[PDB]
């Protein structure tokens, strides 16, 4: 994609699109940057993730509105048809992200920071597919999410400190997976609690700026525990 634009120009334009809140443009620019075939820096991985999280976030919010309307009507075909249209577009965005991870971001990611980041992304976009799945592959989709999150957890436990923001965001989202997708609220609560407590005990090692980064995500873990218990 965007094969005639320079890699650095795509990156520069992705940053401009974020400033303009043009997330679909942002995602297309970062897709083009990925397809240049070079590995992504820390900042570039964040741009990729921010772009697609925004795009699919708007699609998920729309799908939920329409699914709610459709369920009320089942207590013409237009509501179902339009929910299907949005659902198909959402699935296409998830497939696009998963295809970028599989060709070839993950296999070239050797460092813990990049490999865990991409595997967390892989778990997230299978989780989004699972949110809308209802057929013969719901279980396989859930298992693909679980497997990606689990491999990322294993690496992050071995290779990153308990306060690392990627390690914390990964555990947060895997706990949401357990609660919302896998029907395992006790696993969700246990993971969030253990994650929060082990980060708390490591905060003494951090600078002021890293402390702010870690405690912000710890608060999200606490907010979920408050809702779940």
């Amino acid at each position: 994609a965007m094969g005639s634009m320079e890699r650095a120009s795509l990156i520069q334009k992705a940053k401009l699109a974020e400033q303009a809140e043009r997330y679909e443009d942002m995602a297309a620019f970062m897709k083009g940057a990925v397809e240049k075939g070079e590995e992504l820096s820390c900042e570039e991985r964040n741009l990729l993730s921010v772009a697609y999280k925004n795009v699919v976030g708007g699609q998920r919010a729309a799908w939920r509105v329409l699914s709610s309307i459709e369920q009320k009507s089942n207590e013409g075909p237009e509501v179902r048809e339009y929910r299907e249209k949005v659902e198909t577009e959402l699935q296409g965005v998830c497939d696009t992200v998963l295809g970028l991870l599989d060709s070839h971001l993950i296999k070239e990611a050797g460092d813990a920071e990049s490999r865990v980041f991409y595997l967390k992304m892989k778990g997230d976009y299978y989780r989004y597919l699972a949110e809308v799945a209802t057929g013969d592959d719901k279980k396989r989709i859930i298992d693909s999410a679980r497997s990606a999150y689990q491999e990322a957890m294993d690496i992050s436990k071995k290779e990153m400190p308990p306060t690392n923001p990627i390690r914390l965001g990964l555990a947060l989202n895997f706990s949401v997976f357990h609660y919302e997708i896998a029907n395992s609220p006790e696993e969700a609560i246990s993971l969030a609690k253990t994650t929060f407590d082990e980060a708390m005990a490591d905060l003494h090692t951090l600078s002021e700026d890293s402390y702010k980064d870690s405690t912000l995500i710890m608060q999200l873990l606490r907010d979920n525990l408050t809702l779940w218990t």
């Binding site: 974020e18 964040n46 741009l47 993730s49 921010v50 999280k53 925004n54 976030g57 997230d124 965001g169 947060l172 989202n173 949401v176 609660y179 919302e180 995500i217 999200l220 907010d223 979920n224 809702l227 779940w228």
Partner: peptide, 9 residues
């Protein structure tokens, strides 16, 4: 339940 917002960077 909130996942990481991750929509600004």
């Amino acid at each position: 339940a909130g996942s990481i917002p991750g929509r600004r960077s």
